[PDB]
Design a protein around this ligand. Structure first.
Ligand code: 3DV
Length: 269
């Protein structure tokens, strides 16, 4: 079939770093993909990690092409955009929506962790929605291997985004990868349910973080969160990463397992 490898770049989807993401549409088939354009003036590791990934709640990597110094990553197009834009400031979103997004986020993170990959920058800007509002973890530029040949490596590079980062990353030279991603998922849940972030960073000089440690959940954002999800947050947002709840136990949590949401036409007679 002639022309089937030709794609028109038709819309800017995002920028940041020294790159852009373009909506690309196939000339023949009209398939829409996202193309991440990175001018190499790191991306080899991101491509390598991307090639490992095959799960319904992770942005699919289709392949890559390089033309000189511009590298092209072909990725699953997510027409719903960022979870960030489903969060109403100071409100959040309906609790059943947040629970459903949280389920899909856990499935994605369970998958990455089982193949030994940590994302390291989980936040609503990096959680994309397809046309059916299915959540997809995106952007593996800060991602790394924390397990190989069944042997765990401790991390020591400070990275991520301060309001989402686990306190051990600010306090300790080395830390386990998995509790860090769990923590950031808890801050995402807090955001979805309160429409605000609890602190600038989880440090002993952050008053809002100190209030949480002192259990002042009569304050915001906690006062906006029902007691059931708040009880999950109490288990996730635990300062000691060894005492923090693990994903297997998140999946046994009462709120996590609470029926809340009807499924996604019909007629009467
Ligand atoms: N794969 C994607 N699909 C949709 C959108 C997007 C993001 C915001 C608004 C919008 O309408 C679309 N963004 C991407 C995307 C996001 C991040 C990456 C990445 O690997 O950095 C690659 C692609």
């Amino acid at each position: 079939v002639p022309f089937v490898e030709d794609w028109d770049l038709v819309q800017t989807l995002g920028e940041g770093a020294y790159g852009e993401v373009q909506l690309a549409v196939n000339r023949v088939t009209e398939e829409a993909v996202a193309v991440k354009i990175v001018d190499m003036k790191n991306i080899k590791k991101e491509i390598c990690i991307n090639k490992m990934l095959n799960h319904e709640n992770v942005v699919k990597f289709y392949g890559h092409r390089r033309e000189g110094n511009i590298q092209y990553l072909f990725l699953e197009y997510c027409s719903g955009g960022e979870l960030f834009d489903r969060i109403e400031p100071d409100i959040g979103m309906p609790e059943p929506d947040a629970q459903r997004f949280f389920h899909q986020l856990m499935a994605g993170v369970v998958y990455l962790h089982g193949i030994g990959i940590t994302h390291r920058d989980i936040k609503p800007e990096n959680l994309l929605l397809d046309e059916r509002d299915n959540l997809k973890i995106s952007d593996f530029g800060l991602a790394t291997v924390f397990r190989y040949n069944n042997r765990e490596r401790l991390l020591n590079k400070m990275c991520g985004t301060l309001p989402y980062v686990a306190p051990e990353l600010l306090k300790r030279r080395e830390f386990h990868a998995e509790p860090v991603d769990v923590w950031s998922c808890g801050i995402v849940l807090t955001a979805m349910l309160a429409g605000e972030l609890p602190w600038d960073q989880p440090s002993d000089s952050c008053q809002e973080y100190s209030d949480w440690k002192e259990k002042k959940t009569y304050l915001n954002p906690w006062k906006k969160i029902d007691s059931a999800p708040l009880a999950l947050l109490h288990k996730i947002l635990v300062e000691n990463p060894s005492a923090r709840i693990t994903i297997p136990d998140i999946k046994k949590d009462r709120w996590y397992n609470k029926p809340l949401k009807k499924g996604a036409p019909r007629v009467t007679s």
